[PDB]
RNA sequence: UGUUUGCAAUUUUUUAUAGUAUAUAUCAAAUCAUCUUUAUGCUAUUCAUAGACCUUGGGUACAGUAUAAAAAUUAUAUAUGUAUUAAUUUACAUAUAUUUUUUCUAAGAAAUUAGGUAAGAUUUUGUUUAUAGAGAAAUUAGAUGUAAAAAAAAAAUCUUAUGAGGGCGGAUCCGCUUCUAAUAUUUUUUUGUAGUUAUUAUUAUAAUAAUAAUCAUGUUUAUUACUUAAAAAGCUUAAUGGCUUAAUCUUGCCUUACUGUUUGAUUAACAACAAAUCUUA
């Protein structure tokens, strides 16, 4: 009971009748937030257009490569489109071992570790 | 230029940044103290109402983005390191790994009506009702290709707990609700049972669990806590089953009570919950993907191991 | 602006979120409780360590914004306050530890490593906030590891073989698939034979390149950034691969 | 400390605070945000000068050079002009003082920025009301086959603003009303005002007839003008009154 | 008259997380601990590091 | 200068409370006369009620 | 001084001034319980003050990296140690309680409430995919697609018009009717399909062409519009019909589930009458 009463007190401060009220800004305060909200959503637009511009440029570099490759005769006696048809195959792309977990598991960090990189890694 | 003349000339954005001498005289704490009085209130005293009564009611509510609104939630406090990771390294790898080339002058693909109509010379066919979905009774969504305009991402996550024994012992529901509160940072909503089963002592229409939903950054942070702090600490964990997937780009899997108390938020105050009351949970990761093989390819990009099942 | 905006928003969450209940995390009159109450009083009641001093209630809750040049919103100041709050300030007996006998916590590692200071271009722990590219010199032009495609292999089987025959097998690498991310064409001189190079993307997770006993006539190597490739690779060679670059 | 300065809070704050422009209040996030919008306004202005010159080249370009000819030359200048009109709004839609100036009614309606915000304000509440009145009172199709208003019109009788569709006493409506109009497109134009009674009973033929209670043409108007008193359309305001104000009336028993 | 609900969110702190590799990053959580040291995580697990021999005991 | 504005604020309020009380006085007076009036009308059989 | 403390920002109204109807201020009401002691307390330091580490206390602090200068201040009954003074006065220190500040035992965890009105939501059943405990049977999460810069122009076919008060006969009614306008229809004769971002090619960062992307000045959990067979669920009880654009569901405020009289119908209710049903003023 004493431990359960402690839980119920945690749900009491979260009651709709006890949580803090909606903010009340004056004008100069309301306009300062309107200016900060307008610059944040603009910063997000710039980061979006940049983010999406690079993706479109990577995509076009792939297209220009896979368009040339589609019209290449070779190597040797292989006919036109061979390498192109071999590059468009998706064998193993949608399986369990598609992306190595040593690469995906390494998410970014604010500061590096004691050993940032392991040059002594051996096969 | 005449066009530049139509712009506002009293530009406040083109003003110089403040001065230091004038910044040293700006002391909001001293203004109120040295005032020795209360400033008169402004005659503008509009306050958002508690109810929305229509688009034509005299008193209208502002959008949730308005700070004075009742739905306002303060904006981002940080950048989740797993969203930055995906948008920085992985997004281009999925776009490169899953890429099918379309020649330049390829005509667009016109989708065909999935509810077919009767076509023919029989006079009956004219006013026949459209045919049923071929195969299943409900139409499944069609898969979109992964391109520079469709990168599958994580949208939200739903954590839920089903506690049937809470009908006998109401304390199991208070504890289950407090774990999902600390595990997620939201206030869960109680759920009820829907079917009667005498063998299982299950009565219908009685509170028997809770559920949360976290969106945006909160969902990316929850995955970081889960993939990198919780799942690695489960004893003899093989991975997420390869059978998971609803056929629309959403992944589901369940945890045990011995794995829910591994969450840093639950193991810090583990002594405040009674014994043998911390529940398990069902975690549904909803992605922007459009297939089971796209959602599995997305989680593999985040460090989620799968095992054949 | 991101640092100012986060800090600006962490104080709005102070005015709208429910208060902090210490009784839900610390048992009364214990080592954890006494440690919390001591460091809480030094913050003047604010249970948070990264928003300075601000009371969401009272006659002063309207003054929530900091002025220009405020160290409080910086990312160096919050980490200083989060580390100053992690040190145990109360021995397990319950008494305050002297101001001199307190153990400072191990501080985070710096973002700029030693290689960043020296400028070693053969090091992979350099420029940790950017993408590094492996260029190799062939007995001399800097380029990426290339090789002719035999009639037996494809583009992804040749790239995997060329890389091993060029930089050793001691690199934990991953060819990102079979699709080429860039290409460079050298027209023929009507004579001489032209070249149609198709580049495949690769990621390295551990190891280091090794040019000993390489089958191709390679001399040196280095790991460069995008801004550095522009000064090392040829103008036409660079114009063809730059579309493959990333944000960082 | 007179009323000409504003409200009491202003006159009180204007004497207990410092003289510092609102845009220079040394707040950290307010200034970092101001710099983001300052560097963006300079990028929109630089874009207006770039598209402006791009039109000069296309203008000097003879239609014979265009694959589509004169038709393809105007469809391309039409798109550049519109693109320019959008950058002129986006160059000031983020200004905090342009918003203050507009909300105070002190906005220059000769500029696209203030007319853009005036129409947005009008289309939020007052347009939805007039739209509902036109449909529920069957003004369409009775008077016009289709009608989508594009300017604001608020009429008042003896200083008292009347709501759209309100039943007014015959003594109140005995004098010509005063229209508070607002146009949202640039330039000066001539307006024509017509007041029509749509429910005049004609017992002889057992049907309703229409009757004009006011008619006036050649009323010059610009987006800067606000008030128009129909009494003064001949003497003060330039116009041609075809029919002076007739007091509205309704015989007993009719709807 | 549809009700306009308000959000009921508990107090959230900013926490420093130090993984087993010594790397650090900041998160947002409800627990009041300022620094969370992790001795066992994905950086020290054989299922996430199948090519790390230090963690391989055979 | 702030005390003057506050005195103007107090004066406008105290003035309204005075004119508001004077209006409430007259209303209670008119309600007292209306509820006290009694109109006895000739209904039938020479009876008044 | 209700309204957030740096400044004419919502709607209508009162009063006053200027002004000849407008303009500003002001007032009230609606929308909303935002919490408000400018310090009287706390904190750090120093000194008197005993003296082997004590009470009580007097100063000091100068505040944008805001500050010691309020992170939340009430009141009372009993008893006690110290000290007090002309006092169980006062302060201190507890223990026992009772208290206001509603601010700490989840009703936004419960009840299947069925009518009037207003707003909002619009496949809820079943089937099916997946999902710790979980199994034939428990919960949760899913299950259509499209569109969102912008048109311009010529003819024809009708149909409409309280359009031209059209014309000819017997302004408005009827029959003939030409013109104009509007909706619809044609696979119709077409014109245009940009701009922006980037890519490739050519030309000398700009121009031209081609290709791709493009609802987005907006807290992406976007939003908005249209579309998503039939059955089923729901709608007081069987069956049939109907409703999904409301007759279902949710919420707010309510009780018209009102009083009297009365119209036209149910091809003159039930193949009469009567009790009935619907409907108007
Ligand atoms: N959101 C929009 O206004 C918008 C406009 C046009 C297109 N889109 C499309 O939507 C998809 C992407 O949406 P998005 O661009 O809005 O994503 P977004 O990531 O920028 O916004 C989603 C969430 O990320 C947060 N966020 C963004 N930047 C952050 C930062 N630096 N630090 C911390 N948090 C941050 C946002 O506040 C929000 O919570 C794409 O298909 C894009 O083209 C979105
Ligand atoms: Mg963004
Ligand atoms: Mg269902
Ligand atoms: Mg099962
Ligand atoms: Mg009903
Ligand atoms: Mg109701
Ligand atoms: Mg009959």
């Amino acid at each position: 009971d004493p431990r359960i009463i402690n839980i119920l007190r945690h749900f009491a401060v979260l009651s709709p009748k006890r949580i803090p009220p909606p903010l009340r800004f004056g004008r100069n305060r309301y306009l300062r937030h309107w200016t900060i909200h307008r610059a944040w959503l603009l910063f997000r637009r710039q980061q979006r257009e940049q983010r999406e511009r690079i993706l479109m440029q990577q995509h076009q570099s792939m297209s220009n490569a896979c368009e040339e490759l589609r019209n290449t005769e070779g190597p040797g006696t292989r006919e036109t489109g061979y390498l192109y048809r071999v590059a468009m195959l998706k064998n193993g792309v949608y399986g369990l071992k598609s992306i190595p977990i040593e690469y995906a598991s390494r998410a970014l960090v604010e500061t590096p570790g004691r050993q940032a990189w392991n040059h002594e890694w051996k096969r | 230029i005449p066009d530049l003349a139509e712009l506002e000339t009293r530009s406040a954005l083109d003003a110089p940044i403040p001065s230091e001498e004038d910044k040293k005289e700006f002391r909001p704490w001293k203004r109120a103290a040295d005032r020795k009085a209360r400033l008169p209130s402004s005659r503008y005293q509009y306050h958002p109402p508690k109810y929305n009564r229509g688009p034509l009611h005299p008193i209208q509510s502002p959008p949730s983005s308005d700070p004075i609104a009742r739905d306002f939630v303060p904006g981002p406090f940080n950048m989740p390191r797993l969203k930055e990771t995906f948008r920085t390294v992985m997004a281009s790898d999925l776009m490169t790994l899953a890429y099918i080339h379309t020649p330049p002058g390829t005509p667009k693909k016109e989708p065909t009506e999935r509810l077919r109509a009767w076509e023919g010379d029989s006079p009956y066919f004219a006013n026949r009702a459209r045919r049923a979905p071929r195969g299943a009774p409900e139409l499944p969504i069609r898969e979109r290709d992964i391109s520079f305009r469709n990168i599958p991402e994580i949208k939200e996550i739903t954590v839920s707990t089903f506690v049937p024994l809470g009908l006998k012992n109401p304390d199991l529901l208070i504890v289950a609700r407090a774990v999902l509160l600390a595990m997620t940072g939201t206030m869960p909503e109680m759920t009820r049972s829907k079917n009667n089963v005498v063998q299982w002592q299950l009565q219908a229409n009685k509170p028997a669990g809770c559920k949360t939903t976290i969106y945006g950054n909160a969902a990316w942070e929850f995955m970081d806590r889960l993939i990198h702090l919780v799942l690695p600490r489960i004893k003899d964990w093989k991975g997420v089953p390869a059978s998971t997937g609803d056929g629309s780009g959403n992944v589901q899997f369940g945890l045990n009570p011995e794995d829910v108390q591994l969450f840093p938020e639950v193991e810090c105050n583990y002594d405040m919950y009674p014994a043998k009351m911390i529940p398990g949970c069902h975690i549904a990761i909803k992605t922007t993907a459009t297939s089971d093989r796209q959602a599995k390819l997305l989680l593999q990009s985040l460090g989620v191991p799968f095992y054949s099942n | 602006f991101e640092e100012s905006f986060y800090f600006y928003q962490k104080r709005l969450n102070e005015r709208l979120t429910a208060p902090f209940r210490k009784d839900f995390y610390f048992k009364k009159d214990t080592a954890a409780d006494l440690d919390w109450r001591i460091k809480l009083k030094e913050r003047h009641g604010v249970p948070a360590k990264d928003i300075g001093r601000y009371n969401p209630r009272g006659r002063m809750a309207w003054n929530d914004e900091v002025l220009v040049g405020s160290q409080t919103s910086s990312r160096k100041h919050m980490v200083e306050k989060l580390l100053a709050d992690a040190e145990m300030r109360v021995s397990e007996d319950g008494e305050e530890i002297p101001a001199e006998d307190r153990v400072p916590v191990e501080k985070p590692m710096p973002r700029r490593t030693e290689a960043d200071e020296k400028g070693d271009v053969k090091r992979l722990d350099r420029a940790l906030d950017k993408t590094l590219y492996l260029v190799v010199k062939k007995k001399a032009k800097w380029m990426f590891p290339t090789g002719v495609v035999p009639t037996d292999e494809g583009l992804h089987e040749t790239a995997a073989r060329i890389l091993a025959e060029s930089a050793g097998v001691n690199m934990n690498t991953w060819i990102v698939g079979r699709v080429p991310v860039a290409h460079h064409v050298v027209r023929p001189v009507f004579l001489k034979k032209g070249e149609k190079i198709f580049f495949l993307k690769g990621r390295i997770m551990a190891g280091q390149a090794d040019l000993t006993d390489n089958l191709h006539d390679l001399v040196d190597f280095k790991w460069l950034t995008q801004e550095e490739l522009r000064s090392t690779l040829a103008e036409e060679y660079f114009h063809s691969v730059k579309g493959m670059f990333a944000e960082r | 400390g007179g009323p000409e300065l504003g409200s009491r809070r202003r006159r009180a704050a204007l004497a207990t605070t410092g003289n510092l422009p609102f845009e220079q209040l040394p707040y950290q996030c307010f200034q970092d945000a101001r710099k983001i919008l300052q560097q963006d306004r300079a990028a929109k202005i630089a874009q207006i000068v770039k598209e402006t010159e791009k039109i000069k080249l296309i203008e000097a370009r003879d239609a014979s050079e265009f694959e589509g000819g004169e038709a393809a030359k105007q469809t391309r200048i039409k798109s550049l002009r519109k693109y320019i009109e959008e950058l002129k709004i986006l160059a000031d839609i983020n200004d905090p003082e342009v918003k203050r100036r507009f909300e105070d009614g002190r906005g220059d309606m000769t500029k696209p920025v203030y007319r853009f915000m005036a129409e947005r304000r009008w289309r939020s509440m007052d347009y939805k009301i007039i739209a509902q009145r036109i449909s529920q009172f069957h003004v369409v199709p009775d008077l016009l086959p289709a009608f989508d208003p594009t300017m604001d019109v608020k009429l008042s009788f003896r200083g008292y603003q009347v709501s759209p569709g309100a039943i007014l006493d015959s003594r109140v409506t005995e004098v010509a009303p005063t229209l508070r109009m607002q146009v949202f497109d640039k330039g000066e134009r001539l307006l024509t005002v017509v007041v029509i009674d749509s429910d005049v009973p004609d017992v002889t033929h057992d049907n309703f007839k229409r009757r004009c209670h006011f008619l006036a043409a050649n009323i010059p108007w610009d987006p800067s003008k606000t008030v128009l008193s129909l009494r003064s359309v001949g003497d003060r305001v330039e116009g041609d009154v075809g029919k002076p104000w007739l007091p509205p009336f309704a015989q007993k028993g009719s709807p | 008259a549809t009700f306009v609900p308000r959000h009921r969110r508990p107090y959230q702190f900013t926490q420093l997380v130090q993984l087993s590799d010594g790397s650090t990053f900041t998160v947002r959580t409800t627990m009041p601990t300022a620094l969370y040291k992790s001795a066992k995580d994905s950086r020290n697990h054989l299922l996430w590091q199948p090519s790390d021999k230090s963690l391989k005991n055979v | 200068v702030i005390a003057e504005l506050i005195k103007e604020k107090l004066a406008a309020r105290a003035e309204y409370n005075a004119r508001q009380s004077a209006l409430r006085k007259l209303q209670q007076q008119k309600m007292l006369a209306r509820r006290g009036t009694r109109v006895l009308r000739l209904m039938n059989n020479y009876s008044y009620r």
Side-chain angles (χ1 to χ4, degrees), chain C residues 87-235:
Chain C
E87 69 183 6
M88 175 51 72
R89 209 149 178 181
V90 160
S91 50
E92 301 300 286
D93 60 67
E95 286 189 354
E96 294 82 354
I97 305 185
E100 77 199 73
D101 196 7
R102 254 197 273 98
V103 198
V105 177
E106 189 192 4
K107 294 205 184 69
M109 297 282 291
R111 313 239 308 167
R112 297 185 67 259
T113 57
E114 165 172 14
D116 269 314
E117 187 77 60
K118 296 174 120 291
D120 202 5
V121 296
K122 301 209 179 194
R123 275 258 140 172
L124 273 151
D125 57 5
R126 182 187 72 95
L128 297 169
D129 60 318
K130 306 186 199 179
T131 307
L132 296 187
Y133 294 79
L134 173 70
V135 299
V136 179
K137 184 187 242 178
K138 169 167 282 181
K139 174 246 173 179
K141 277 271 175 167
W142 295 93
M143 65 181 193
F144 300 103
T146 62
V148 190
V149 176
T151 318
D152 192 28
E153 290 176 339
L155 289 176
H156 59 284
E157 307 175 46
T158 305
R161 195 196 81 242
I162 264 56
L163 189 61
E165 295 175 356
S166 301
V169 289
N170 287 319
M171 297 189 297
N172 199 12
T173 57
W174 173 51
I175 313 305
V176 182
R178 309 152 158 257
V179 176
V181 300
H183 85 293
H184 180 57
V185 179
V186 186
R187 299 286 162 191
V189 185
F190 289 94
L191 61 81
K192 186 171 172 59
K193 287 176 69 176
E195 307 181 340
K196 281 187 177 184
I197 314 177
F198 298 97
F199 299 103
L200 265 85
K201 194 187 191 206
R203 304 294 215 182
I204 183 176
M205 300 89 81
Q208 173 58 296
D210 193 5
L211 268 50
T212 57
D213 302 353
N214 49 233
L215 281 70
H216 317 267
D217 299 332
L218 312 171
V219 167
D220 293 353
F221 73 91
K222 44 166 65 172
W223 294 85
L224 292 179
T225 58
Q226 308 178 353
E227 310 175 16
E228 299 164 341
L229 297 168
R230 181 144 35 205
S231 58
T232 294
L233 299 176
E235 72 196 65

Side-chain angles (χ1 to χ4, degrees), chain F:
Chain F
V1 177
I2 314 313
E4 302 295 346
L5 287 161
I6 296 158
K7 281 185 289 188
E8 181 179 350
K9 175 58 172 176
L10 282 154
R13 173 150 299 289
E15 188 276 347
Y16 184 74
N17 288 16
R19 187 165 61 174
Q20 191 67 6
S21 64
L23 208 70
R24 293 277 296 284
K25 183 201 67 46
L26 191 145
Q27 287 188 352
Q28 293 176 221
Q29 168 171 335
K30 194 174 182 179
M31 281 166 52
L32 198 78
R34 186 180 182 176
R35 77 197 298 94
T37 305
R38 216 178 298 243
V39 188
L40 314 171
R41 303 190 172 278
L42 186 65
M43 305 301 299
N44 53 23
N45 303 333
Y46 316 110
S47 61
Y48 285 81
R49 64 176 190 80

Side-chain angles (χ1 to χ4, degrees), chain B residues 115-134:
Chain B
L115 301 182
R116 304 160 291 163
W118 293 85
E119 285 111 342
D121 271 38
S122 192
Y124 298 79
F125 292 0
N127 297 334
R128 279 195 185 176
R130 276 176 290 175
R131 313 193 56 172
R134 213 176 177 182

Side-chain angles (χ1 to χ4, degrees), chain B residues 26-42:
Chain B
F26 207 74
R27 303 166 111 190
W29 65 265
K30 193 161 180 293
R31 268 135 50 189
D34 289 345
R35 181 170 290 128
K36 254 57 171 173
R38 282 149 47 198
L39 226 55
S41 61
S42 64

Side-chain angles (χ1 to χ4, degrees), chain A residues 31-83:
Chain A
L31 294 171
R32 280 188 255 122
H33 179 94
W34 182 90
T35 314
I36 297 157
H37 171 79
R38 275 258 154 193
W40 180 247
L41 262 49
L42 192 72
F43 172 75
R44 279 174 57 196
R45 164 178 294 267
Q46 300 164 0
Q47 298 289 287
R48 191 200 316 141
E49 298 169 344
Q50 195 203 350
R51 181 210 316 152
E52 297 189 336
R53 199 200 335 285
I54 293 168
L55 288 170
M56 197 165 68
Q57 294 176 305
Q58 291 166 343
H59 161 90
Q60 292 164 333
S61 208
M62 257 192 292
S63 304
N64 299 334
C66 301
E67 189 61 16
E68 262 282 1
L69 189 67
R70 191 175 67 91
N71 305 291
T72 52
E73 56 183 5
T77 324
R78 308 316 269 278
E79 51 168 344
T80 60
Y82 171 66
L83 299 177

Side-chain angles (χ1 to χ4, degrees), chain D residues 45-56:
Chain D
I45 293 167
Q47 195 74 352
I48 295 163
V49 180
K50 169 164 162 290
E51 304 298 344
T52 280
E53 298 173 350
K54 190 179 293 191
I55 289 169
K56 291 174 172 54

